[PDB]
Subunit: 376 residues, 3 copies
Amino acid sequence: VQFRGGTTAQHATFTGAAREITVDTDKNTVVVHDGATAGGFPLARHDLVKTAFIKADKSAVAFTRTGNATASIKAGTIVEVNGKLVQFTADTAITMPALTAGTDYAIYVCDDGTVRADSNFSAPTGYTSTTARKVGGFHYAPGSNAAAQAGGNTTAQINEYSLWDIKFRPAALDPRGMTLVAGAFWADIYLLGVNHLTDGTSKYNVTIADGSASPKKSTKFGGDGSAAYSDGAWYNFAEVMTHHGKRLPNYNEFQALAFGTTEATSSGGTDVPTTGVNGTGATSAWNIFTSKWGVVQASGCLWTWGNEFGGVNGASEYTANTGGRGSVYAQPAAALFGGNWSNTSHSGSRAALWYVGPSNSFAGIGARGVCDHLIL
Amino acid sequence: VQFRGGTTAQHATFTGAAREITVDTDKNTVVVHDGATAGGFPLARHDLVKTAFIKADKSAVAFTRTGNATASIKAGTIVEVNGKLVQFTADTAITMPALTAGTDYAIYVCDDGTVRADSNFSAPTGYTSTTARKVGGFHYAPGSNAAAQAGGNTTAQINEYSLWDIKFRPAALDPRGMTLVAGAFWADIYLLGVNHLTDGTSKYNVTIADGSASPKKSTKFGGDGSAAYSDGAWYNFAEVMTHHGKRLPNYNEFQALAFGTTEATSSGGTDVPTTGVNGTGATSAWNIFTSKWGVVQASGCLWTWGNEFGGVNGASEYTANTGGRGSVYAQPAAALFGGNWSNTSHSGSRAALWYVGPSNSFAGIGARGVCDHLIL
Amino acid sequence: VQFRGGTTAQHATFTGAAREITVDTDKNTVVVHDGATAGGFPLARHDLVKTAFIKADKSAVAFTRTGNATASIKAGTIVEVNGKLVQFTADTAITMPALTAGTDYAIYVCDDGTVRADSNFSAPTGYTSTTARKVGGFHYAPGSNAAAQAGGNTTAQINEYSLWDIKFRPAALDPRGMTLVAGAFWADIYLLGVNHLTDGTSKYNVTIADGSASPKKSTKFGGDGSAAYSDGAWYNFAEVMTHHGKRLPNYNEFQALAFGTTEATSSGGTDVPTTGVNGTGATSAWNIFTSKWGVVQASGCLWTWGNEFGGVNGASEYTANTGGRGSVYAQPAAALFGGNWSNTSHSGSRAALWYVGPSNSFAGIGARGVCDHLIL
Ligand code: MMC
Ligand code: MMC
Ligand code: MMC
Ligand code: MMC
Ligand code: MMC
Ligand code: MMC
Ligand SMILES: [Mg+2]
C-alpha cells in the first residue's frame, strides 16, 4: 500500500483535504493537510532530534543522590539514544557497579530503557557506545562533604555536588573529578598531580605537583608526555590548567570552594605528598580539610597559585626569569591561597599570601583548577 | 483501520515500497519508505522536541520594546508548550497587566496561542505552569535609561536592555533585575540590598547593604536566613554575589555598566540609604546617576567593591583579619569603583580607589553584581 | 483520502487500536496508537526542529582541514535548512572559491545538499540566505602557524585552529579573525586596528591602533563612527573590546596565545604600523612572531594592554585622569604583555611590564582581544 506523494516543489502549490496525508519524496517524510494551507504541515524526521536530552528542571542536575552508594535519574527526563526514545516518568534508580573510593563514574541511558553507572567512560559493561549513551556522572569520594566547618569524615560515598550531566556541567574539556561550588562554578576535588596528562588534573591517591615534584610538561606547549617542567613556577601551573580548559582560582572562588574546611588550621609536619591522604608528620588528618562541596585538602595542605596578581613587586628592571620567554618589570606577586602544612593557625579558606613572584618555586606550592558552570 | 507494523529489529531488514508507511511498534512512530533504503525513514516523536524554542535571530532577544509600557514578541518565534506548537509569523503584541515602577515581569507563551506578561514568575493570571510557558521577561524601571551622559528621567517604563529570554540571558541563577550592557555582559540594575535572600541582589526601593547595614548572611555559607554579617567586608559581599551566581565587577565592566551617568558628580549629603531613591541631604536626584543601560545609582552614590586587587598593600606579616578564616600577608587593596555620596567631583564611571583592604567596612561601601551574557 | 481525526481534547480520552493512525486537527500532526495508551503518541512537526544542527563529536569543530586550501565537513553532521534535512555520512569536501591571504570565509550547507565556502557572510554566490545556511567558517592566513617556537612561514593557508561552527565558537558577537588557543579560549589573530567598527577588531593589512593612532570611538559609548579617541589609554582599548563582546587578555591567556612565537626577540627598528606586515626598520620579519595557534605579531611588535592590574602605583591622591569620568587613587598600573619593537631581548610570550598607568598613551602600546570558547 503506497500513499499519494510528490516532490517538495510539487508540494508547495498543493492544498490537500482536511486530514489527508501525503508523502514528500524528496524529504522522505509525511505531510499533514487541513484543506486550506498551501504546502501542508511537514512532520520531522528522527535524524533531526538525535542527541535530544530534555529535563523537567533545567536549572538542576538530572540525578538525585539517594544514599552513600545509590542515586536516581529524575522524573521527566527524556533521552534520545540509538534512534530510540527513552524517558523516565518517575524517579528511577541507577544500577550501580562496585564503587571504589576516589573513582569517577559515568552514567549511561541505554536503548533498552535501562540506566546504569560504570567506571568506563566509553561504554558500560554489557553494552556498546552505540546502544549506551553517556549522559553524566559523579565522583565517589574517599569521605563525606563537610556538614559544618570542621571538614568531613572518611566514609566513602557519592559527592552529591559532583553530579554532572551533559547540560549541567563544568565547561572544562573533561568533567571528571570536579564539584559544583554553591551552584556557581566548578572546582577540582584534588590538587594537581604530577601525572595530569594521564590522570587529569584531579585524582585521588596520586603524587601532588609542587616545587619539589613539578608537573608533566603540557603536550599542547612543547611537552612530549615524559618530560616535567624544570620547576613549579606559576607560569607552569597556569599552563597546565589551560591545557585542560581550566584556570587557577581567584580570591572569590577560593573562599567559596574552601568553605567548610577546618579554619585557621594546617596539616602540620614536613610535607603533604599525596592527594586524599594524611601528610608526612601530620597533626591533623586529611579529612579535616574537606570543604562543604567535597573539595579535598582545600586548605592548610598546600598553597595554590591563584589567577590574580598584587602585593609585593619584583625589581623595577627588565628581568629574564620566565623560562626563556621574555622579561618582566615591576612584576607583582601571584596570589597564593589556602596555606600549606607549615602555616600553623594562618591557613584557611581566606588565607592569602601576596609576596611570591610567579617565577618562584617551592615545595609547599601547588595548584587547584576551576572553570565555569554551564547550563544549556 | 490498522497499518502494517513491526518491531525495530523487524524494521532493520525491511525495505518497503516507495510512499509506503509502516508503524514501528517499539517506538510507536511512523516510518516512511522509498523502495530502496533498508529500515526506512523513522519520524520523530513529539516528546523529543519538548521545550523547543526557535528564534529567527538568535543573536538578539526575542522581544521588542514598542513603547514605555508595551512590547512585542518577534516574527519567526516558534515555541513548544504543553505538547503544542505556537508560532508568531508577525510581530505580536504582548498582553500587559498593570505595570508598577521598580518591578520585574515574566513573559509567557500559552498553549492557546496567546502571549502575556505577569508579575508572577510561576504562572500568569488565568493559566497554570502547564498551559503557560515562561520564555523571558523584563524590568519596568522607575525612570528612563540615559539618552546621553546626564543620567535619565523619572518616567517609569520598560528598560529595553533588561529584556531577556531563555536563550538570551544572564548566566546568573536568577535573571531578574539585570540589564544587558553593550551586548557584552549583564549588570544588576540596583546596588545590593540587605534582604537579598528574599529580594534577590537587585531590587527597587530597598535598604542598601553597606558597612553600617551588612547583608544577610548567605544560607549557602552558614547563614540561617535571619543573621547578617558582622560587617561589610569585601569577603562578605563577594560571598553574597557567589550565592546568587554573580560576581563583583572588574574595572572594564564597571566603566561599561556606568557609562551614561553624570560624570564627576556625587549625590552629596550624608547617606544613600535606599535603591532608586534620593540620598539623605542629596544635592543631586537619584536619576542623575542612571547609566545608558538603566543601571540605577551607577556612580556617585556608593562605592562598589570590585573583583580586582592592587594598589596599597597591608602589612608584610600574617594578619588574621578574615573573620576567622586564616591570615593574609602583604594583602593588596580590593578595588572600589564609582565613588560615594561624599566624593564630590571624583565620582564617575571610571572612579577607582585602591587603598582599602578587603577586611575593612565603611558606610559608603556596598556592592553591585554582574555575570556573563549567555546566547544559546 | 482523509483520515480519522479529532481535536486535542477529543484525543485525550481516546485509545485507538494498535497501529492505528489519527490526525490531531488542532496540531495538524499525526498520532500513532497502540491499543492501550490514552491519547496515543503524537509526532513532531518539522517547525519544531528548525535550525537543528547535530554533530557526531560535539567536543570538536565540524570541519577538518585537509590541506592549505581545502577542508571537509565531518561524517555524522546533520543540518536542518529551509525545511529540509541535509546530512553527510562520510567526510565531504567543502567547495572552495578563490582564497585570498588575510581573509575570512563562511561555510554554508545548502538545501540542495551541497557545502561550500564564501567571502560573503550573508549568502554564497548562486544562493540566498534562505536556501543556504551559514554553519561556520575559517580564516585564510598570510602564513603558517608555528611548528615549533620560531614563528611561522609566509605561505597563505587555512589556519586549522580558526575553524569555528555555530556550536563550537568564540562567545564574541562576531567570530571572524579569531583562533582557538589550546582548545581553551579564542584570541584575535591580529592586533586591534583603528577602523575596528568596519573591519572588526582583527584584520590583516590594516593600520594598528596605538598611542599615535587611536582607535575609532565606540558607537556604543558616544562615538559617531568618525571620531577617534583623544589617545590610546587603557580605558579606550578596554572600551573597544567591550563594544565587540571581547576583553583584553590576562597573563595566563597571553602566555597561551603567544606560545610558538620567537622568544626573547623584538621586531626592531622604529615602528610596527600594520598588521601581518614587516615593521619599519625591522630586523625580523613579521612571521617570526606567529604563535602555534596562528596569532600574528603575537610578541615583540606591540605591547597589548592586559585586563589585569598590579605593579607600580600612581599617587595616593584623587587624580582626574580618566577622560572626565572621575578620579583614581593609588591606581595600580595596567598590565602590558608581549613587548614592542624596541624591547630587544625582553619581548616574548611571558613579557610583562607593570609600570604604566591606564591613563597613559604611547606609540608602542595597542591591544589584542580574546573571549571564551563556547561548546553547545
Ligand atoms: C544506561 Hg545501560
Ligand atoms: C573558562 Hg576555565
Ligand atoms: C502567554 Hg498566556
Ligand atoms: C560567571 Hg557570574
Ligand atoms: C552550502 Hg551551498
Ligand atoms: C566574555 Hg568576552
Ligand atoms: Mg590584580
